[PDB]
Amino acid sequence: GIVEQCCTSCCSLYQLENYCN
């Protein structure tokens, strides 16, 4: 995250752990 951040740029899997339940 941000979802834009991964797409337009680069993001770690760790930043994805932020959108989990």
Swiss-Prot record:
Transmembrane segments annotated in the record for this chain: none
Q: Which cysteines are joined by disulfide bonds?
A: C6-C11
What is this protein's record name? Insulin A chain
Q: Give the source lineage, highest ranks first.
A: Eukaryota, Metazoa, Chordata, Craniata, Vertebrata
Parent-protein residues present: 90 to 110 of 110
